[PDB]
Amino acid sequence: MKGNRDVINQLNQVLYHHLTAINQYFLHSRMFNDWGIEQLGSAEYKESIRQMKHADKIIERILFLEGLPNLQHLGKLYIGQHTEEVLQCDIRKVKENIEAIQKAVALAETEQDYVTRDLVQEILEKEEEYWDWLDTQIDLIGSVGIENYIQSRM
Amino acid sequence: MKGNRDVINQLNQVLYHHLTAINQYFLHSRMFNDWGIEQLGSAEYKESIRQMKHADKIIERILFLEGLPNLQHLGKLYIGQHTEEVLQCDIRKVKENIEAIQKAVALAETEQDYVTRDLVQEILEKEEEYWDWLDTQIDLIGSVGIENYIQSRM
Amino acid sequence: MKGNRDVINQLNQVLYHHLTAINQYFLHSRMFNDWGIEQLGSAEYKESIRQMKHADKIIERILFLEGLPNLQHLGKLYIGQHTEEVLQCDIRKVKENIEAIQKAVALAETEQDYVTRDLVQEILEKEEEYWDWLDTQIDLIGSVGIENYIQSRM
Amino acid sequence: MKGNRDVINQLNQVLYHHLTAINQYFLHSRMFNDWGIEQLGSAEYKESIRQMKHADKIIERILFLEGLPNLQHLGKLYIGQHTEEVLQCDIRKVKENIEAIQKAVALAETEQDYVTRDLVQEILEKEEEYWDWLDTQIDLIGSVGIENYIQSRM
Amino acid sequence: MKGNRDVINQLNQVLYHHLTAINQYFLHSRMFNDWGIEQLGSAEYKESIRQMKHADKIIERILFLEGLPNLQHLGKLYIGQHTEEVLQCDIRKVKENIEAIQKAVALAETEQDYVTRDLVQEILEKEEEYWDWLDTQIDLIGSVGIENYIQSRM
Amino acid sequence: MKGNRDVINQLNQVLYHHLTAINQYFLHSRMFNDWGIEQLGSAEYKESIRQMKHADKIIERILFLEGLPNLQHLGKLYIGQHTEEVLQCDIRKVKENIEAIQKAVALAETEQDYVTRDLVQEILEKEEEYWDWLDTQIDLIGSVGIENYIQSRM
Ligand code: HEM
Ligand code: HEM
Ligand code: HEM
């Protein structure tokens, strides 16, 4: 293939994690909506769409490199049963995403696939943003209490 | 739970097929784009998005009925290696979708879940449309030849 | 020089307090934002910008009077560790600002620098407004409780 | 000079390749137009202009670094005599561009000229895009036949 | 903290230099205006605002990494007494900025904080732009003479 | 071939001079910009683009006449080291351009290639305009002095 095989394999790992995140965040969105917590339903939906866009770019990059995108398998979904637990499940997932993306950055650099590096660098910045937003929600549950926090996210 | 357990379980079967169809069709879109056959890339993307909307509607219906939507599992993706084979892989997938939807209609009717029936009846109408479109593409390959057919779908 | 030396020196005292207030308020803004308390982040940003405009007006007045604006030095920043303490740190800072401004008004009047007096009198009016706003926030924390107060300032 | 001499020398190599590509793609554009294959005439023109823009940015970067941009010499032009051969000649050229750009990225990194690195990283992404487009045209000539392919590019 | 401690410390160094540059350029702006050299007053103001924006992004990045932004201290201000000397003082300052930013890029890379790296890479590009503009003004004073140069910058 | 071989060969001589002029003028533009003399940067850019359009028209004319445009070779670039020398280098280049164009007009007339003659006659009119502009700049340097002249072209 035109691309580096090891780079292609790690891009498929990143895709695996994006595919997993799409489904986790999407179900979390619809669970929050079913509960009437509509603003967190929206935030989870937006991040699900963001993950879908990430996956699209990785698939297209893998195909350009003449590799085979792997959409057949998923990782473990972390599904919470109440608001605070959902947030902690998302935190667990985004940390997995970031670790995989960081290793893709490091590997692309070593193999001199600089365009791939910049692609996953762009995704990483957004994953840090979602991690930050989740951390903030946890702290706010601490500051205002879970009853006030949910009320605010209706 | 408020909904019927067998109806709930068959809705998760329909969701499984939609989630699987999402990934098959989306990959086929990007492969057609990778091959330079952009009108088939676009058609496949549109059908993937429709499957995404179908899955959304089913997830929301399962949650209202107080069941647990299952997004953890995926079926076999039928991935083609050239234009004609891709179309045949899609035909195989939509036939699986339609069969699961038909059993959901029949079962929803029996259990007097008339609102679920109407939801899955609407999805069925769209699945028949995609099936018809695929049949037409295969016939057109026969009528005009694969070289003219691909040329037309650039 | 064309201006009065004591007036010039007290204007640099006012500038010192504005420069210090810029940094305290700006950091408090970004800390509130980091905590998810965005309306207090916004209020603190607005007051930092006002302090930036105050400092600008004083610098321009010192230069017209042919003195040397001193931007090299900073006072103690009072940095809080939670919402209520931040507000109290700001109250301490604005009280220092107002005291320096009041001495500038009194001294400008004595030395018949009536244009400088009016400049610092305008700044004072705005500093009293920020002081009033801070007092109100503290009272509101008392009336509604810190959990409701923070919830409201998200 | 303010810049690193070795970095400057490699930037002049990249410029050499951009200057060469401008002329190859431009002549190919006008040859396709002379043949009546106007859509490939347009694609070659757009890429010629893109190469001109690349050259502009490299020249300006070399001058900022206090080096001497070398516009006096050109590399070998690969000029095809029929559609498929033209595409293969462009593929040969873009591969030369990318190799020179990749070595510029690697060298800028080692010498800690991070702004130069980002400049050539941006160009590289576009060169990969043109390489991809060319690969696609070759495959389409395979899929639809050269007679249909040219017809489509009129 | 979630961030790397050494990266956080170097980000605080970059902030230190941005805080210093804000004040130097701002005073230089108002000094040029006091002298009637309004176009250089404007250029210094714009760059002061640019430095303020740089500082904002670094503060927010430090807080995201769970570090403590240090706004309490400033570096030495280089304040000129006539047009050419002001420009040379700014040149001294921007070189300090760039050295600190380059070491932040190198350190972020080593510790695999790739989003921080991209943030300071973006700032660096702008600092090179201001350095270039300053170099140009010095040369123009050489070409046209200081009397013509100031006249032009009124 | 459909065109006259000697006419075809002289058209390639004109193209050679345009391609050479493109590069000289474009570099002069970016050098003037690098020096802060932006109105001369702009004037030189405009003349480079005109030379690019001239080269395009000649390439298209050679191809219609079924000859082979030669873009592989370049003449001596006359690169100045200061404003006055640059202008003199441009004067030398446009004089070469005009001489090649004049021989193309005379030869096209002899061989009754009246359409080619009119094409090169139009280009000549524009080359005389650039020659006139350059002469004016040199005279203006004499009338106002180089320091005022450069000041005016900032
Ligand atoms: C499996 C990999 C998937 C990929 C690559 C993918 C890709 C995309 C893309 C590219 C878009 C358009 C984004 C935009 O234009 O703003 C989109 C939209 C959407 N996706 Fe997905 N998607 C995936 C899975 C899913 C799943 C599993 C669901 C539901 C559980 C879903 C639900 C949606 C919805 C509801 C939309 C909005 C469509 C619209 O309103 O137009 N997606 N997806
Ligand atoms: C000390 C760190 C500072 C930071 C982080 C900071 C930050 C900012 C920011 C983020 C803006 C808005 C920029 C925009 O939206 O375009 C701004 C504007 C401004 N700053 Fe600062 N600033 C600082 C210090 C100063 C100082 C010391 C002065 C005066 C000597 C100053 C004078 C101004 C002025 C006059 C404006 C324009 C405000 C307006 O017209 O809306 N700043 N600053
Ligand atoms: C040799 C190095 C060259 C450089 C750095 C260069 C640079 C440029 C630039 C910066 C533009 C404007 C792009 C834009 O604003 O969109 C341009 C336009 C153009 N160039 Fe070049 N160019 C070069 C050579 C050539 C050559 C050799 C030709 C012809 C064979 C050519 C033909 C054109 C044409 C036809 C245009 C469009 C101008 C217009 O319609 O405004 N260029 N070039």
How big, in percent rounded to 5, are the helix, strand and coil portions of chain D? 80, 0, 20
What are the C-alpha distances in Å from C66 to residues C69, C116, D141? 9, 13, 78
Of A140, A152, A23, A42, residue with least CA distance to A89 = A23
User: Residue E146: how many CB atoms within 10 A of its CB?
Assistant: 13
DSSP annotation string for F42-74: HHHHHHHHHHHHHHHHHHHHHHHTT-----S--
Contact C125/A at CB under 8 A: no
- In angstroms, the CA F112 to CA F3 distance is 10
Residue pair E119/E128 in contact (Cβ under 8 Å)? The answer is no
Instruction: Give, for ligand 2, the residue of C42, C52, C74 to mutate: max count of ligand atoms closer than 8 Å to Cβ.
Output: C52
- In angstroms, the CA A92 to CA A86 distance is 10
Q: Which helix H or strand E contains F73, and what residues bound it? A: none
DSSP annotation string for C92-141: HHHHHHHHHHHHHHHHHHHTT-HHHHHHHHHHHHHHHHHHHHHHHHHHHH
For residue B53 and ligand 1, the question of a CB distance below 6 A is answered with: yes
What is the Å distance from ligand 3's center to B151 Cα? 33
- In angstroms, the CA D131 to CA E27 distance is 51
Of F110, F97, F114, residue with least CA distance to F6 = F110
Amino acid sitting at position B94: V
Give the number of whichever ligand sits closest to the CA of residue C58: 2
List Cβ neighbours of D129 (8 Å cut-off, separation of 6 or more): none
Place of tokens 């305008």: C122
Of A14, A7, A8, A4, residue with least CA distance to A68 = A8
Contact E138/C at CB under 8 A: no
| Residue A135 per-residue DSSP state | H
Contact A39/D at CB under 8 A: no
Contact E73/C at CB under 8 A: yes
Q: Which helix H or strand E contains A145, and what residues bound it? A: none
Q: Which helix H or strand E contains A77, and what residues bound it? A: none
Residue pair C126/C54 in contact (Cβ under 8 Å)? The answer is yes
Token readout for F153 is 């072209």
CB neighbour class for B147 (10 Å; exposed up to 12, middle 13-18, buried from 19): middle
For residue B45 and ligand 1, the question of a CB distance below 6 A is answered with: no
User: Angle at which helices D38-64 and F5-34 pack, to 10 degrees?
Assistant: 40
- In angstroms, the CA B90 to CA B79 distance is 8
Could you list the beta-strand ranges (E) of A4-148.
none
From the CA of A55, give the closest atom in ligand 1: 5
Of B18, D78, E63, D129, residue with least CA distance to C37 = E63
Whole-number CA gyration radius for chain D: 17
DSSP annotation string for A97-110: HHHHHHHHHHHHHH
Give chain F's count of helices (H) and strands (E): 5, 0
- In angstroms, the CA A57 to CA A69 distance is 11
Residues from chain C contacting residue A149 (CB–CB below 8 Å): 151
Of E98, E131, E113, residue with least CA distance to E14 = E98
| Resolution of the experimentally solved model in angstroms | 1.9
Token readout for C120 is 């610092």
Token readout for F65 is 């006449």
B34-43 b/e (C-beta count within 10 Å ≥ 16 → b): bbbbeebbeb
Residue pair B38/B128 in contact (Cβ under 8 Å)? The answer is no
Token readout for A105 is 């950055």
Q: Which helix H or strand E contains A14, and what residues bound it? A: helix A5-34
Q: Taking the mean position of all CA atoms in its chain, how far away is CA F10?
A: 16
Q: Which of C36, C146, C148 sits opposite A140 (nearest CB)?
A: C36
Amino acid sitting at position D96: E
User: Residue C12: how many CB atoms within 10 A of its CB?
Assistant: 18
Record: contact F34-D77, CB cut-off 8 A = no
- Return phi, psi of residue D102, to 5°: -60, -40
Could you list the beta-strand ranges (E) of D41-146.
none
Q: Dihedral of CA D84/D85/D90/D93: which sign?
A: positive
The three-state DSSP-derived secondary structure of chain D is CCCCHHHHHHHHHHHHHHHHHHHHHHHHHHHHHHCCCHHHHHHHHHHHHHHHHHHHHHHHHHHHCCCCCCCCCCCCCCCCCCHHHHHHHHHHHHHHHHHHHHHHHHHHHHCCCHHHHHHHHHHHHHHHHHHHHHHHHHHHHHHHCHHHHHHHCC
For residue B49 and ligand 1, the question of a CB distance below 6 A is answered with: yes
- In angstroms, the CA A110 to CA D106 distance is 10
Minimal C-alpha gap between F33 and chain E (Å): 9
Q: Taking the mean position of all CA atoms in its chain, how far away is CA C47?
A: 7
Q: Which of E136, E137, E145 sits opposite F147 (nearest CB)?
A: E145
- In angstroms, the CA B38 to CA B44 distance is 10
Record: contact D112-E124, CB cut-off 8 A = no
- In angstroms, the CA F92 to CA F75 distance is 12
Question: Which residue ranges of F are tagged as binding site for heme b?
Answer: 52-53
- In angstroms, the CA E98 to CA D43 distance is 40
- Return phi, psi of residue B81, to 5°: -110, -5
Place of tokens 């990318």: D98
Q: Which helix H or strand E contains A67, and what residues bound it? A: none
Token readout for F58 is 């000649």
- In angstroms, the CA B86 to CA B84 distance is 5
Residue pair E25/E51 in contact (Cβ under 8 Å)? The answer is yes
User: Residue E10: how many CB atoms within 10 A of its CB?
Assistant: 21
What are the C-alpha distances in Å from A51 to residues A42, E98, F50? 14, 35, 48
Contact E154/A at CB under 8 A: no
Minimal C-alpha gap between F141 and chain E (Å): 12
Of A34, E26, E16, residue with least CA distance to C60 = E26
For ligand 2, atom 32: residue with the closest CA: C52
